[PDB]
Design a protein around this ligand. Structure first.
Ligand SMILES: *Cc1cccc(C*)c1
Ligand SMILES: *Cc1cccc(C*)c1
Ligand SMILES: *Cc1cccc(C*)c1
Ligand SMILES: *Cc1cccc(C*)c1
Ligand SMILES: *Cc1cccc(C*)c1
Ligand SMILES: *Cc1cccc(C*)c1
Ligand SMILES: *Cc1cccc(C*)c1
Ligand SMILES: *Cc1cccc(C*)c1
Ligand SMILES: *Cc1cccc(C*)c1
Ligand SMILES: *Cc1cccc(C*)c1
Ligand SMILES: *Cc1cccc(C*)c1
Ligand SMILES: *Cc1cccc(C*)c1
Ligand SMILES: *Cc1cccc(C*)c1
Ligand SMILES: *Cc1cccc(C*)c1
Ligand SMILES: *Cc1cccc(C*)c1
Lengths: 21, 21, 21, 21, 21, 21, 21, 21, 21, 21, 21, 21, 21, 21, 21
């Protein structure tokens, strides 16, 4: 990804599986 | 992705499977 | 990834499996 | 990755498996 | 990785398995 | 691919070129 | 692909070229 | 790939070239 | 790959070139 | 690879070139 | 791409972003 | 890419970002 | 890439970022 | 890459970052 | 890489960073 601004102001969960970035 | 501004102001869950970005 | 600004202001979990970055 | 600014202001967990960076 | 600024302001756990950086 | 049950009961040939799975 | 049940009961040939799955 | 059950009951050939899994 | 059950009951050949798993 | 159960019950050949696992 | 014969006889510029070939 | 014959007879610039070939 | 014949007859610049070949 | 014939007949610059070949 | 024939007939610069060949 690029220039991602992930600011949930709360619970944050990121679950990925076999990605190709 | 590009220039993503993810600001839910609350619970944030991201679940991905075998992506190709 | 590039220029990621991950600031949830809370619980942060990152789970990855066999990625290719 | 590059230029990652991981500042959750809270609990931070990073779990990776067989990555290729 | 490069230029990683990991400042959670809290509990920090990093678990990796057979990476290729 | 996921949950592939390849049971031809005979000759089986799989030829792939530069895939992105 | 998902939940593929390939059971030809005979000769099976699969030829692919530069796929994106 | 995941949960692949490759049981041809016969000749099995798998030929791959520059994959990205 | 994960959970691969390769049981051809016969001749088994696997040929790979410059993979990225 | 993980949890690979390679039981061909016969001739088994594995040929790899410059992999990145 | 395959069998590309790029012969502009002049200035040639190719700019790509996050492709999936 | 395959069988690319890039012969511009002049200035040649190739700029790519996070490709998946 | 395969069988690339890059013959610009002039200035040649190749710039890549985090590729997956 | 394979069988690359890079013959620019001039200035040649190759710049790569975190590749996976 | 394999069978690379890098013959620019001029200035040649190769700059790489954290590759995985
Ligand atoms: C943007 C992004 C998030 C998680 C994993 C990847 C490969 C990319
Ligand atoms: C934008 C994005 C989110 C999660 C995963 C990917 C590959 C991309
Ligand atoms: C952006 C990113 C997060 C976690 C793992 C990878 C390979 C990339
Ligand atoms: C950005 C990143 C996080 C954890 C592991 C890797 C290989 C990369
Ligand atoms: C960025 C990074 C974190 C942990 C392990 C590796 C190889 C890389
Ligand atoms: C399902 C599958 C078969 C062969 C190659 C790939 C990448 C995927
Ligand atoms: C379902 C399937 C068969 C062969 C190749 C791919 C990428 C997918
Ligand atoms: C499912 C699979 C078979 C052969 C090669 C790859 C990368 C994946
Ligand atoms: C599933 C698999 C078979 C052969 C080679 C690789 C990298 C993966
Ligand atoms: C699953 C596997 C078989 C042969 C070589 C590699 C790197 C992986
Ligand atoms: C044909 C082609 C040109 C540039 C980039 C890609 C992925 C493909
Ligand atoms: C054909 C091609 C040109 C530049 C980069 C890639 C991955 C492919
Ligand atoms: C064909 C090619 C040019 C530059 C970089 C890669 C990974 C591939
Ligand atoms: C074809 C090629 C050029 C530069 C770097 C890589 C990994 C591959
Ligand atoms: C083909 C090639 C050029 C420079 C560095 C690597 C790892 C590969």
């Amino acid at each position: 990804c690029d220039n991602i601004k992930h600011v949930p102001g709360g619970g944050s969960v990121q679950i990925v599986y076999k990605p190709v970035c």
